[PDB]
Amino acid sequence: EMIPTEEALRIVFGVSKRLPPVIVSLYEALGKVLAEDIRAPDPLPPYPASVKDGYAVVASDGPGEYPVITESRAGNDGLGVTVTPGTVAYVTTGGPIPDGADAVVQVEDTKVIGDVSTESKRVKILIQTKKGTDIRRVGCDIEKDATVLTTGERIGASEIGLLATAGVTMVKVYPMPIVAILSTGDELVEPTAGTLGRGQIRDSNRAMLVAAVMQQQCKVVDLGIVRDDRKELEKVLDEAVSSGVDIILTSGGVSMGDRDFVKPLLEEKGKVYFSKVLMKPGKPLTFAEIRAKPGKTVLAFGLPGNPVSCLVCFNIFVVPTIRQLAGWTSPHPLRVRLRLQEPIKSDPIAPEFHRAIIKWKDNDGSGTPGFVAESTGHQMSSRLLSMRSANALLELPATGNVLSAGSSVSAIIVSDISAFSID
Amino acid sequence: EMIPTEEALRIVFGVSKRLPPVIVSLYEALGKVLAEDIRAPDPLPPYPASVKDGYAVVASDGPGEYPVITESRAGNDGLGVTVTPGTVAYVTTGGPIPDGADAVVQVEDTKVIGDVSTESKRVKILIQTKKGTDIRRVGCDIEKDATVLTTGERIGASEIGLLATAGVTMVKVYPMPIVAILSTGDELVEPTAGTLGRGQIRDSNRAMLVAAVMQQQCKVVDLGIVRDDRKELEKVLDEAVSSGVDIILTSGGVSMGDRDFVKPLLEEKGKVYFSKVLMKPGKPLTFAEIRAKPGKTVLAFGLPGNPVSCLVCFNIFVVPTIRQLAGWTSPHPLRVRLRLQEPIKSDPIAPEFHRAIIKWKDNDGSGTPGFVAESTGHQMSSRLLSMRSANALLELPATGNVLSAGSSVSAIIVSDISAFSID
Ligand SMILES: Nc1ncnc2c1ncn2[C@@H]1O[C@H](COP(=O)(O)O)[C@@H](O)[C@H]1O
Ligand SMILES: Nc1ncnc2c1ncn2[C@@H]1O[C@H](COP(=O)(O)O)[C@@H](O)[C@H]1O
Ligand code: MOO
Ligand code: MOO
Ligand SMILES: [Mg+2]
Ligand SMILES: [Mg+2]
């Protein structure tokens, strides 16, 4: 019972539930989705503020020479002083406008007159300004009680700046899921192994997945290598489910071998929604939901053992699940359209997620700017070098035809689009 | 002496030098740029490995019933057993191929014959296979001594997987720069302040920059609020320069006020390359290089105080500097072309970095897929709400003309393109 990827994703989305919100500190809120609206407790600026370094004037006075009656840069500077017609006040950018002044003339349109500090301060205003010029009225950037951030908004640097503006240092957010990761196989040895014994390989999926989960900003619970023994894998899965994690990722032990126990163990512990997906690479992907005994849900992905299939299934299915649990309203990956830089043979049986290195060009080959893709070469699921530098997965339909250079395909972007190397 | 942004970026790039490489552990290498090539010490697979769960056969035998002479899943399974013509061996995916077998027939093309474990094991091979089918020969994924990663390559999840495959757990990389951050101003109060006194605002730039630097994966040295006092700012800058940081970010104290000491202090401590940039927002941006006394270079950015200008200058100038110091060969931000969803008035004096929310659409308005942009509204440099959710900066030339909806502009992508919300 092999299901299409679109259905497998819908099933995963339907089962995945946003985590309960928590309260975190300002810097812990970075990267998280807001679980409450944020309202400004005071206006910005809270006082009428100068846009410029210069002089606060009565605009109707016009060009002329005037005494400087106060200097206003911050705090109580100029408190109680009224700028009346025929006077001016020195101001710096962000300085409070003294009462009575209704415009600011930038310092470049003024000239200091008389002996610097050996006579009372006088300045020549060189222009005719207009009422309100270069003054930020109270609340013109942010009004008191305005909503500056809303529930469901992801917190980036400017949102941290808005929380700080509003004096919020404890924030209600959706947390990231905690993810347990294990590898399976009698053939595996730790990546610290030197000379390999006959029939041994280094466990590469576990470190790869730990890294992938770290890129998604989740806490990792590293459960190590598990051997192809049903009782042993049951014990580790039972320990993982009762530990408080939200997602368990296993790799391997999910194909057709007589010692592949992931599927029967997930069927016994919880509910397996699927164990076969019509995709290349990634056919053995298994997804299950387990209820931890009181009491919460744990999502389990029995990822394929083949290194490419493992990472592709992580990118397509686990990344949107992490985002959904973390409260993202748009957990789907970015899909763009792009032109192939070389010919690519699609698979005749399953739609292929072909690894590519994509870049934006001024000419994508059709005379207009656009993304272009180069294949990473041989796409065998055992060839982790096919994932090297791959920032996208080309979605090739199961036609079996050769897609020529210059033809357009849909591509899933799997790595930070703002970290893309330019053409 | 106001210089174009293109020149200001060239000056910064010319002064910025990659940091000395360091040795880090496997998981610390994630996100860093490799400073050495990585070669596979053994092949992958190191033994001829089955692609399938099934039976290792002599392909020339063809369809028929055969005794199963061994079972090979991992390690020393089947060591010393030779599959001769007229025999087969059970194998699981990744299991070593016994000597003498030259093809694998997947279990779906076989049938077990006789009483399960109450008679010696026999299997019917249902197809005529071909020599080499479903076997991974030694080194077919990675050859012994092949270079699997090269100097200058950024380490993502698949690169961590390749390091683990190759048994590398200590990696030579370029480190991230350490960044000191301070705010300036007599008007500032901490973001924990409740009711604000007259002429006070909360310091929002510092937390915003700490967050921005944390998104760039750099260590932050938070030097707090500094008042508009030359001796005090000199002391903090001198302490920052001798602390071992690589970059200092200040904000404010760089306009035309009589208590703006950042520029004269940077001129005194080191070499100021520029202090005026032809851009909107961000005109007061100052850049300097200071030599810390023995002995290393410290880059200083006197960022503008206006919150928008501060973050825009961070995105345009500081992000590529961090990347250059961290050894990125492509530190420039991603620039794409896109269509405007609404009309935008460009500035008549300076090229504007207009904040936008961009998304990829199936129809960008011209009948072909592409990025589209919505303005974040009023672009005043004091209005941090104009940065809210902005994932790009539209590069508008200094024409002063109204760019109509549907016209195309260049846009700098400033936030993870793989975290873009879909249309
Ligand atoms: N942690 C791992 N690291 C590298 N390769 C793996 C890992 N787990 C399984 N494999 C390989 O992936 C393939 C499928 O594994 P399995 O699903 O257990 O049969 C076999 O060739 C395994 O040797
Ligand atoms: N850390 C900060 N947070 C928020 N606003 C700031 C900060 N530093 C300076 N400003 C404002 O930015 C503008 C320019 O500051 P300056 O360059 O010091 O004149 C003034 O309106 C300041 O009040
Ligand atoms: O069975 Mo796969 O789709 O090569 O991991
Ligand atoms: O002087 Mo600006 O360019 O509004 O920070
Ligand atoms: Mg296995
Ligand atoms: Mg200031």
Side-chain angles (χ1 to χ4, degrees), chain A residues 2-118 120 122-292 294-415 418-423, chain B residues 2-118 120 122-292 294-415 418-423:
Chain A
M2 194 147 62
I3 58 160
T5 63
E6 292 75 7
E7 194 183 341
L9 286 163
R10 276 194 299 276
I11 286 166
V12 170
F13 190 98
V15 166
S16 299
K17 302 297 182 225
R18 186 172 67 193
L19 296 169
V22 292
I23 304 307
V24 305
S25 68
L26 187 55
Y27 294 128
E28 289 176 340
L30 180 64
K32 299 190 172 55
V33 175
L34 269 176
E36 62 181 341
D37 287 356
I38 302 298
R39 286 180 293 283
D42 31 56
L44 194 82
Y47 55 87
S50 183
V51 174
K52 298 283 168 71
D53 303 291
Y55 293 84
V57 307
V58 173
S60 60
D61 285 342
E65 192 181 311
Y66 303 97
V68 182
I69 69 159
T70 190
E71 305 182 344
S72 182
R73 307 187 188 77
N76 291 320
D77 291 357
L79 174 60
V81 184
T82 300
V83 166
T84 55
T87 71
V88 304
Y90 177 64
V91 290
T92 57
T93 304
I97 302 308
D99 291 351
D102 65 11
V104 165
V105 176
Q106 67 195 344
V107 72
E108 292 82 355
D109 296 321
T110 74
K111 184 198 287 193
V112 170
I113 301 299
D115 211 319
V116 54
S117 307
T118 314
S120 120
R122 295 187 75 76
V123 77
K124 196 177 166 175
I125 300 299
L126 307 175
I127 64 152
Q128 173 58 67
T129 198
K130 186 184 184 186
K131 186 181 178 168
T133 297
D134 283 327
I135 294 174
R136 284 161 62 224
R137 48 145 268 280
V138 170
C140 71
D141 296 297
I142 304 178
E143 295 280 1
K144 174 170 172 163
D145 308 322
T147 299
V148 297
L149 298 165
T150 51
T151 302
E153 193 160 9
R154 197 179 173 214
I155 300 164
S158 73
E159 296 73 22
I160 288 292
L162 288 161
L163 288 161
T165 300
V168 180
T169 45
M170 298 299 296
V171 195
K172 192 183 177 170
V173 297
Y174 297 109
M176 303 311 294
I178 301 168
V179 184
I181 301 170
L182 61 87
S183 282
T184 71
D186 287 358
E187 78 289 13
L188 306 179
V189 294
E190 295 291 332
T192 54
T195 305
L196 300 173
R198 181 189 184 274
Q200 296 182 328
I201 57 166
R202 296 186 190 83
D203 176 6
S204 61
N205 289 349
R206 184 158 48 92
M208 181 178 77
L209 287 173
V210 163
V213 171
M214 282 169 76
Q215 292 187 116
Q216 298 298 320
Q217 312 298 311
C218 296
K219 177 176 172 66
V220 171
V221 175
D222 182 342
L223 297 181
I225 294 173
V226 183
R227 301 303 178 182
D228 300 318
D229 180 283
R230 197 184 194 281
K231 285 250 167 259
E232 227 141 62
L233 183 56
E234 184 178 26
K235 181 175 182 295
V236 177
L237 289 172
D238 283 352
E239 287 165 344
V241 168
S242 68
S243 71
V245 302
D246 303 290
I247 296 171
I248 295 165
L249 303 182
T250 68
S251 78
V254 279
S255 307
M256 298 293 291
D258 65 344
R259 296 196 184 173
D260 283 353
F261 298 118
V262 170
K263 292 176 289 194
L265 287 171
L266 297 174
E267 288 175 347
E268 185 193 312
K269 266 92 251 294
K271 183 163 176 186
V272 171
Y273 291 86
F274 55 90
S275 54
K276 288 277 122 56
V277 185
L278 188 64
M279 68 186 293
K280 181 160 133 64
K283 187 184 129 177
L285 182 63
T286 299
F287 175 65
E289 185 189 24
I290 303 159
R291 169 120 277 170
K296 75 156 169 193
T297 293
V298 183
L299 298 184
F301 292 88
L303 303 169
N306 278 304
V308 173
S309 307
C310 181
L311 190 53
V312 166
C313 288
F314 181 84
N315 292 344
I316 297 174
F317 300 90
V318 184
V319 169
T321 300
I322 284 165
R323 291 173 168 189
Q324 170 117 306
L325 265 56
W328 288 42
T329 54
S330 203
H332 295 54
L334 176 60
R335 268 174 173 75
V336 304
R337 202 87 192 175
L338 59 76
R339 293 197 176 280
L340 302 178
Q341 291 264 77
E342 63 188 291
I344 297 177
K345 175 78 163 67
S346 70
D347 187 86
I349 294 137
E352 187 185 48
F353 292 83
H354 190 115
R355 278 71 69 201
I357 301 174
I358 81 165
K359 72 182 156 170
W360 181 271
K361 289 193 78 198
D362 299 324
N363 194 337
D364 68 358
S366 80
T368 59
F371 285 112
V372 301
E374 265 182 57
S375 166
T376 55
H378 293 299
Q379 302 292 293
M380 199 161 167
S381 65
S382 53
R383 184 186 176 253
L384 184 56
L385 285 172
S386 75
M387 301 303 300
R388 185 189 168 183
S389 325
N391 56 8
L393 295 174
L394 312 178
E395 304 185 277
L396 314 185
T399 59
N401 302 328
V402 174
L403 305 177
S404 63
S407 69
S408 96
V409 300
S410 175
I412 296 164
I413 293 178
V414 297
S415 75
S418 58
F420 273 20
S421 301
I422 67 162
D423 180 42
Chain B
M2 194 147 62
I3 58 160
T5 63
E6 292 75 7
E7 194 183 341
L9 286 163
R10 276 194 299 276
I11 286 166
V12 170
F13 190 98
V15 166
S16 299
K17 302 297 182 225
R18 186 172 67 193
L19 296 169
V22 292
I23 304 307
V24 305
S25 68
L26 187 55
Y27 294 128
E28 289 176 340
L30 180 64
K32 299 190 172 55
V33 175
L34 269 176
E36 62 181 341
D37 287 356
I38 302 298
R39 286 180 293 283
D42 31 56
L44 194 82
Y47 55 87
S50 183
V51 174
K52 298 283 168 71
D53 303 291
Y55 293 84
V57 307
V58 173
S60 60
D61 285 342
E65 192 181 311
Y66 303 97
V68 182
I69 69 159
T70 190
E71 305 182 344
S72 182
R73 307 187 188 77
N76 291 320
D77 291 357
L79 174 60
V81 184
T82 300
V83 166
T84 55
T87 71
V88 304
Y90 177 64
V91 290
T92 57
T93 304
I97 302 308
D99 291 351
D102 65 11
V104 165
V105 176
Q106 67 195 344
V107 72
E108 292 82 355
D109 296 321
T110 74
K111 184 198 287 193
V112 170
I113 301 299
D115 211 319
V116 54
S117 307
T118 314
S120 120
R122 295 187 75 76
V123 77
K124 196 177 166 175
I125 300 299
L126 307 175
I127 64 152
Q128 173 58 67
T129 198
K130 186 184 184 186
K131 186 181 178 168
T133 297
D134 283 327
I135 294 174
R136 284 161 62 224
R137 48 145 268 280
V138 170
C140 71
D141 296 297
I142 304 178
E143 295 280 1
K144 174 170 172 163
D145 308 322
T147 299
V148 297
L149 298 165
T150 51
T151 302
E153 193 160 9
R154 197 179 173 214
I155 300 164
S158 73
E159 296 73 22
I160 288 292
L162 288 161
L163 288 161
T165 300
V168 180
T169 45
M170 298 299 296
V171 195
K172 192 183 177 170
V173 297
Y174 297 109
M176 303 311 294
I178 301 168
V179 184
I181 301 170
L182 61 87
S183 282
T184 71
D186 287 358
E187 78 289 13
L188 306 179
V189 294
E190 295 291 332
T192 54
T195 305
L196 300 173
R198 181 189 184 274
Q200 296 182 328
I201 57 166
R202 296 186 190 83
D203 176 6
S204 61
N205 289 349
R206 184 158 48 92
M208 181 178 77
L209 287 173
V210 163
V213 171
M214 282 169 76
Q215 292 187 116
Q216 298 298 320
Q217 312 298 311
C218 296
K219 177 176 172 66
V220 171
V221 175
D222 182 342
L223 297 181
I225 294 173
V226 183
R227 301 303 178 182
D228 300 318
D229 180 283
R230 197 184 194 281
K231 285 250 167 259
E232 227 141 62
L233 183 56
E234 184 178 26
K235 181 175 182 295
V236 177
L237 289 172
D238 283 352
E239 287 165 344
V241 168
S242 68
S243 71
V245 302
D246 303 290
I247 296 171
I248 295 165
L249 303 182
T250 68
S251 78
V254 279
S255 307
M256 298 293 291
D258 65 344
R259 296 196 184 173
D260 283 353
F261 298 118
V262 170
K263 292 176 289 194
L265 287 171
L266 297 174
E267 288 175 347
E268 185 193 312
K269 266 92 251 294
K271 183 163 176 186
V272 171
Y273 291 86
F274 55 90
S275 54
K276 288 277 122 56
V277 185
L278 188 64
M279 68 186 293
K280 181 160 133 64
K283 187 184 129 177
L285 182 63
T286 299
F287 175 65
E289 185 189 24
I290 303 159
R291 169 120 277 170
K296 75 156 169 193
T297 293
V298 183
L299 298 184
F301 292 88
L303 303 169
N306 278 304
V308 173
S309 307
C310 181
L311 190 53
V312 166
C313 288
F314 181 84
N315 292 344
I316 297 174
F317 300 90
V318 184
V319 169
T321 300
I322 284 165
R323 291 173 168 189
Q324 170 117 306
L325 265 56
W328 288 42
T329 54
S330 203
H332 295 54
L334 176 60
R335 268 174 173 75
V336 304
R337 202 87 192 175
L338 59 76
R339 293 197 176 280
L340 302 178
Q341 291 264 77
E342 63 188 291
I344 297 177
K345 175 78 163 67
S346 70
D347 187 86
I349 294 137
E352 187 185 48
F353 292 83
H354 190 115
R355 278 71 69 201
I357 301 174
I358 81 165
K359 72 182 156 170
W360 181 271
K361 289 193 78 198
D362 299 324
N363 194 337
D364 68 358
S366 80
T368 59
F371 285 112
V372 301
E374 265 182 57
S375 166
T376 55
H378 293 299
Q379 302 292 293
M380 199 161 167
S381 65
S382 53
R383 184 186 176 253
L384 184 56
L385 285 172
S386 75
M387 301 303 300
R388 185 189 168 183
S389 325
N391 56 8
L393 295 174
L394 312 178
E395 304 185 277
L396 314 185
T399 59
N401 302 328
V402 174
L403 305 177
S404 63
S407 69
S408 96
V409 300
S410 175
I412 296 164
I413 293 178
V414 297
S415 75
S418 58
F420 273 20
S421 301
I422 67 162
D423 180 42

